[PDB]
């Protein structure tokens, strides 16, 4: 698996766990590891550089959690701008899907001549 396929796959996973509920980095890492049957151990440094970019892009936002629960924990949430961009990707995949289906429908139904 090449470098940027892994980064894309990691981005798709992080945006989906936030799509389910706000979460903190250590919690995201454990939940992904147990949702991958232990195979996928995400790294904190790469998670923060992804989030730091997604913050300036307006895709996600950050806020400080409760301090009764230990002390000082940053939670991340998928914004409305992020929810809609995921919905468009959404639309775009099922749009590409039937464009491909239409290509061989049209490919063989014309190679007949
Ligand atoms: C649901 C939205 C995720 C997405 C776009 C996206 C990427 C990059 N996919 C991808 O490469 O899947 C691999 C090949 C399995 C790794 C997708 C695969 C299926 C559906 C959407 C995507 C995103 O993560 O880009 C930031 C988006 O548009 O979110 C706003």
Key features of this structure:
Arc Repressor Mutant, subunit A, 9% strand, 2 domains, mainly alpha, 4 helices, elongated, binds the ligand C=CCC(Cc1c(C)n(C(=O)OC(C)(C)C)c2ccccc12)(C(=O)OC)C(=O)OC, two-stranded antiparallel ribbon
Mind explaining what this structure looks like?
A two-stranded antiparallel sheet has the order 1-2. Helices cover 65% and strands 9% of the residues. The longest helix is centred in the last third of the chain and has 32 residues, at 80-111. It is elongated. It is built from four helices and two strands. By secondary structure, the chain is mainly alpha-helical. It folds into two domains: 1-78, Arc Repressor Mutant, subunit A; 80-113. Bound molecules: the ligand C=CCC(Cc1c(C)n(C(=O)OC(C)(C)C)c2ccccc12)(C(=O)OC)C(=O)OC. The ligand C=CCC(Cc1c(C)n(C(=O)OC(C)(C)C)c2ccccc12)(C(=O)OC)C(=O)OC binds next to helix 1 and helix 4.
Measured distance between first and last alpha carbons? 41 Å
**For the largest beta sheet, what order do the strands appear in spatially?**
1-2
The coarse silhouette is: elongated
Specify the CATH architecture of the largest domain.
Answer: Orthogonal Bundle
* Helix fraction bin: 55-70%
Radius of gyration of CA atoms, rounded to a whole number: 19 Å
Question: Would you give the CATH topology of the largest domain?
Answer: Arc Repressor Mutant, subunit A
What name goes with the CATH superfamily of the largest domain? Winged helix-like DNA-binding domain superfamily/Winged helix DNA-binding domain
Taken as a percent bin, the fraction of beta residues is: 5-15%
Order of helical and strand elements: HHHEEH
Number of domains: 2
The main pleated sheet reads as: 2 strands, antiparallel
Q: Under the CATH scheme, which class of the largest domain? A: Mainly Alpha
Number of strands: 2
| Structural class designation | mainly alpha
Tally the helices: 4
Which ligands occur here?
ligand I1A
PDB class: photosynthesis
Keywords: triplet photoenzyme, photocatalysis, energy transfer, photocycloaddition, photosynthesis
Assembly: monomeric
Entry title: Crystal structure of Tpe3.0 complexed with N-Boc-3-alkenylindole
